[PDB]
Amino acid sequence: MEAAHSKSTEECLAYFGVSETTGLTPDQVKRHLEKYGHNELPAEEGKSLWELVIEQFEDLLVRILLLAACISFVLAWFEEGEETITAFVEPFVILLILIANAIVGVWQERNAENAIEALKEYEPEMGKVYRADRKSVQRIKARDIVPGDIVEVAVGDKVPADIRILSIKSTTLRVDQSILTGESVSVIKHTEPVPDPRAVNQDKKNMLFSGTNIAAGKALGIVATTGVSTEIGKIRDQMAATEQDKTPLQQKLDEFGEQLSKVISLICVAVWLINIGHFNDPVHGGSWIRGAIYYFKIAVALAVAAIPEGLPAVITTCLALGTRRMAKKNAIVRSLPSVETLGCTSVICSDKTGTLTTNQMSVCKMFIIDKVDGDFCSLNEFSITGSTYAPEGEVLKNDKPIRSGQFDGLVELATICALCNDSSLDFNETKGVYEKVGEATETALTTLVEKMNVFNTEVRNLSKVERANACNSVIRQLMKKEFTLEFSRDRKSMSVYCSPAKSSRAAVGNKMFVKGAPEGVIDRCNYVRVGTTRVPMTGPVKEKILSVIKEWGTGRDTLRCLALATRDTPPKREEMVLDDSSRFMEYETDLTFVGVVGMLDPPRKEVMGSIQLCRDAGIRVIMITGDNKGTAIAICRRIGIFGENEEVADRAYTGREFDDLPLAEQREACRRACCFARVEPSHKSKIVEYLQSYDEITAMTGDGVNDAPALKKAEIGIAMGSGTAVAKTASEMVLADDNFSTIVAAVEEGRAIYNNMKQFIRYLISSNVGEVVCIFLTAALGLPEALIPVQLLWVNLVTDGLPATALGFNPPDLDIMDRPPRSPKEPLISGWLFFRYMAIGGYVGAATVGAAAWWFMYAEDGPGVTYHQLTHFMQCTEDHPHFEGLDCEIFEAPEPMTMALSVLVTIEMCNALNSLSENQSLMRMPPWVNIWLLGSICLSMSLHFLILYVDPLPMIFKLKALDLTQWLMVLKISLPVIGLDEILKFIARNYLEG
Numbered sequence: 001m002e003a004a005h006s007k008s009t010e011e012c013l014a015y016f017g018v019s020e021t022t023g024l025t026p027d028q029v030k031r032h033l034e035k036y037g038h039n040e041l042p043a044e045e046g047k048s049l050w051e052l053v054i055e056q057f058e059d060l061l062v063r064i065l066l067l068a069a070c071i072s073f074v075l076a077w078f079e080e081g082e083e084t085i086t087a088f089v090e091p092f093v094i095l096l097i098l099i100a101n102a103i104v105g106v107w108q109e110r111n112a113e114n115a116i117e118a119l120k121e122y123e124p125e126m127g128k129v130y131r132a133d134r135k136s137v138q139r140i141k142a143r144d145i146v147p148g149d150i151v152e153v154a155v156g157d158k159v160p161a162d163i164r165i166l167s168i169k170s171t172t173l174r175v176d177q178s179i180l181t182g183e184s185v186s187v188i189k190h191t192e193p194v195p196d197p198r199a200v201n202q203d204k205k206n207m208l209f210s211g212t213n214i215a216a217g218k219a220l221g222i223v224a225t226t227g228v229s230t231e232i233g234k235i236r237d238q239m240a241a242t243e244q245d246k247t248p249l250q251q252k253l254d255e256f257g258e259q260l261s262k263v264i265s266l267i268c269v270a271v272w273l274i275n276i277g278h279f280n281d282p283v284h285g286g287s288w289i290r291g292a293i294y295y296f297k298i299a300v301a302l303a304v305a306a307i308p309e310g311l312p313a314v315i316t317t318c319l320a321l322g323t324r325r326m327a328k329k330n331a332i333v334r335s336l337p338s339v340e341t342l343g344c345t346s347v348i349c350s351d352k353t354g355t356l357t358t359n360q361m362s363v364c365k366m367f368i369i370d371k372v373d374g375d376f377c378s379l380n381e382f383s384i385t386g387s388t389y390a391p392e393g394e395v396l397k398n399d400k401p402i403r404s405g406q407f408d409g410l411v412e413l414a415t416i417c418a419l420c421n422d423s424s425l426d427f428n429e430t431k432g433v434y435e436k437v438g439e440a441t442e443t444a445l446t447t448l449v450e451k452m453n454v455f456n457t458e459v460r461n462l463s464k465v466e467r468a469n470a471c472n473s474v475i476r477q478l479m480k481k482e483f484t485l486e487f488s489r490d491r492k493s494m495s496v497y498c499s500p501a502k503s504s505r506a507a508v509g510n511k512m513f514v515k516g517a518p519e520g521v522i523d524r525c526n527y528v529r530v531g532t533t534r535v536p537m538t539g540p541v542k543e544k545i546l547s548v549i550k551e552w553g554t555g556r557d558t559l560r561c562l563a564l565a566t567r568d569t570p571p572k573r574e575e576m577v578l579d580d581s582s583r584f585m586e587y588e589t590d591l592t593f594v595g596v597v598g599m600l601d602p603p604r605k606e607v608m609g610s611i612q613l614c615r616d617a618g619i620r621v622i623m624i625t626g627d628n629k630g631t632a633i634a635i636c637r638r639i640g641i642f643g644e645n646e647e648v649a650d651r652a653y654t655g656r657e658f659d660d661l662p663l664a665e666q667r668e669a670c671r672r673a674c675c676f677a678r679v680e681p682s683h684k685s686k687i688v689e690y691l692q693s694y695d696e697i698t699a700m701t702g703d704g705v706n707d708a709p710a711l712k713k714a715e716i717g718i719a720m721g722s723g724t725a726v727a728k729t730a731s732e733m734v735l736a737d738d739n740f741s742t743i744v745a746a747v748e749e750g751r752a753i754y755n756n757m758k759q760f761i762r763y764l765i766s767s768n769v770g771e772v773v774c775i776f777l778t779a780a781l782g783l784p785e786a787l788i789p790v791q792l793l794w795v796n797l798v799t800d801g802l803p804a805t806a807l808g809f810n811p812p813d814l815d816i817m818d819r820p821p822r823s824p825k826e827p828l829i830s831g832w833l834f835f836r837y838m839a840i841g842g843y844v845g846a847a848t849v850g851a852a853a854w855w856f857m858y859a860e861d862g863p864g865v866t867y868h869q870l871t872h873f874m875q876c877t878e879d880h881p882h883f884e885g886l887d888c889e890i891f892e893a894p895e896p897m898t899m900a901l902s903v904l905v906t907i908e909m910c911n912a913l914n915s916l917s918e919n920q921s922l923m924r925m926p927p928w929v930n931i932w933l934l935g936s937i938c939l940s941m942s943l944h945f946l947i948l949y950v951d952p953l954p955m956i957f958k959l960k961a962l963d964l965t966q967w968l969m970v971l972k973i974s975l976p977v978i979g980l981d982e983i984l985k986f987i988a989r990n991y992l993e994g
């Protein structure tokens, strides 16, 4: 606990009784835990109140049905309806379907959040600290850090706790603290005291807040506060939902449901108009109000029917369900649209180092100069065993193990690697493995030096903890590190200014030690070290040096190379201005070349596969990396971006080559090229922008801070679990797995959600069109009514519920990942599908009217009215326009009506079976692909039998239907709807378009 940023570095140190370079003792940590608790926020809890999630009423179309239930509650309250109790059923036939869908949505949401919180909580967040028990920085669960330990944080890192900056290791420290202050651009810090106890966070320029991100630099601090006392910890409970509006496809279907409300309204008012000619008929006693309320009831019931009340839930669900599956593949979705968007992605740009490759770097080859004599130049090459970051392995020259201290050239090589390095190693006592701290490239150097052991230091007798940095530390004693010129990607190198260590001999020379991408560094060398000697750089030498790099980079190990050099006579520090990062390169000139290291960095197993799948899915994959063009192309081949032999001249480019081109041609290069190399963070962004200028959906994959811009710019930003917090922050998705395959899976899933949405819509429209076709085909053709207000509410309850919501659990179509991506601006409803909705809608409307007619005319229990309906309904009371005045009222017979209602349900349930797949056959995609659907259907059929045969019920609705033969008819009329769509799918398949 420390109230102050306004006290000096010293004061804070003294406050906790801590040696700045060593950090807390075990016993100091034991106390501070007890006195302050773990560094975490208890919260973790309650993201939605059981109630909250229930209130996914409030939606577009659900509020309509909600209203509809009130009028039925009020029309019932005035003693009537048409029958007395039949009016108190009405409201529950409407609420029921609503409750059902609500239950499922709520369930899927709860399951999703659980699954997500399982994934997020899985891998523990780690911090880096100096503590007294270990000389080198060590990594602990952030949870364990307490006020008063020395914390190290560098570029990319999430600040783990609220920290008072003690010492800035780079020329600058830049923090992205948007999450706290809203401050959108990164901001500069210093280590000087900020006197005002009052001062706002923005003015605490010597502090670093838990949850912010280091955008540039490296720093050392002492922790002031942790857990709930944390500046961000105080404010959590609060905010008006920095939470959010719905997803593009959600807004699309919403707009589609808005204008389906239009059309249904019209057909509804139309029912009420097309009738009310029947608003004087004997049935409601001819009153000049009664049958206007009745046909108003027919309208409303028809609206509730036609309306897809479950559309808002089924999207919500397919979404939550998509998330739940992504979480099961260890992918964290930070932003809902990510799966649907990724669904129609035509291009996946991707970083290389740590993203496409494993980022488990090992130095396996290195060389220095051996002989230089005129046009002859020769190198001492070396091999290094050990693939891992473990200091165990040996240097080989000519298959024989050497003692690197034998070669002065290697002594300097080791010296630079050690000194020009912001990273180190830590040995995990539990996992029992040597882990990097800071960047892999840099750490590889660290582990290299330990292997080279150039001062023959005695290490056989050291713990695995001590052995980690021993040889490095030895070098650190040999030279004092005045300051460092942080690595920056423009010059593609990094520097370190040093003076000799004891101050034993003042002015025997300061040095700068340099490491960097070989082409730039070698260009800034005028000399070439030969052992302890120096000689002028020359063409033949450069050509030699470079060719062996080309060799290693392009070879079968595809080595990642770094050149190392010393500046023998640096500027005086006084002539050096550190404020301006753009002078660092000139400072790094007049160099002496020492040598080269080549690094092994294997491509991930899963990658080549995923790329193949993208090809098939019509998706492009571009590599975009700061690394050398040689090695980047070599790796593309190894990954399958390029085949092992292809002129690539026209479709791999460096940054320079790319910038050399005119804008027009840059844009076009992006369309054919798959490999961009030696490229800055601005370029990654620009390339993505270019792709986006073909109105395509672009995804960026990456691990590093140099990916954030592109990660942000892209439609979907996918960050590695292993990578930086800043890359993760700029992302919509995070592979905690680091498993590239999930990207493809995620594509497939977004594709499937779309297709599931489609099938739902097809199912409802076509079916509910038939329900409407039906009522208008009677009223026009001039028949007795086929259904009543509650009978309409019944087909609705039982066709528009779980059989529909179920489609959302349809499996992926069989060819889903074999057609190219959908353009995002495609007509939601295809002209051709609109037709298919009508074909089906028409058969359904006609099959249900034809059913009641068949009861009347052809049926043996029905009166034998024979063809021509006997031509009207006029008959009325006893024996009229005497046209076989044989039977009196048979109209109002429940039999014809309950016939139709049973064809409607049965047939609707049939073309749900067509809605397992857009254009696939029940022969290839059978009904048992979706069991959930089949259950729902039984539940409906089941519910529909109940209503018919449990003896109070049929009165509330209508008389039952002769099991044995009437059903055989219902089924005979309804089954063909399947045969119809299945020809219609045959059309769209065996002719094709989309």
Ligand SMILES: Nc1ncnc2c1ncn2[C@@H]1O[C@H](COP(=O)(O)OP(=O)(O)O)[C@@H](O)[C@H]1O
Residues within 6 Å of the ligand: 352, 353, 439, 441, 442, 487, 489, 492, 493, 494, 515, 516, 517, 518, 561, 562, 625, 626, 627, 628, 679, 680, 704, 706
């Ligand atoms: N810490 C460092 N110090 C000096 N040079 C580096 C360092 N890290 C990387 N480099 C060099 O700078 C280049 C640019 O790195 P970057 O832009 O991050 O792309 P990538 O890491 O994928 O190569 C690398 O290819 C490597 O040659």
Ligand code: ALF
Residues within 6 Å of the ligand: 351, 352, 353, 354, 355, 624, 625, 626, 627, 704, 706
């Ligand atoms: F890991 Al890279 F460019 F390939 F930063």
Ligand SMILES: [Ca+2]
Residues within 6 Å of the ligand: 304, 305, 306, 307, 308, 309, 796, 800
């Ligand atoms: Ca409905």
Ligand SMILES: [Ca+2]
Residues within 6 Å of the ligand: 305, 767, 768, 771, 795, 796, 799, 800, 908
């Ligand atoms: Ca329906």
Ligand SMILES: [K+]
Residues within 6 Å of the ligand: 711, 712, 713, 714, 715, 716, 717, 730, 731, 732
């Ligand atoms: K983005």
Ligand SMILES: [Mg+2]
Residues within 6 Å of the ligand: 351, 352, 353, 354, 355, 702, 703, 704
């Ligand atoms: Mg990377």
Ligand SMILES: [Mg+2]
Residues within 6 Å of the ligand: 353, 626, 704, 706
């Ligand atoms: Mg990198």
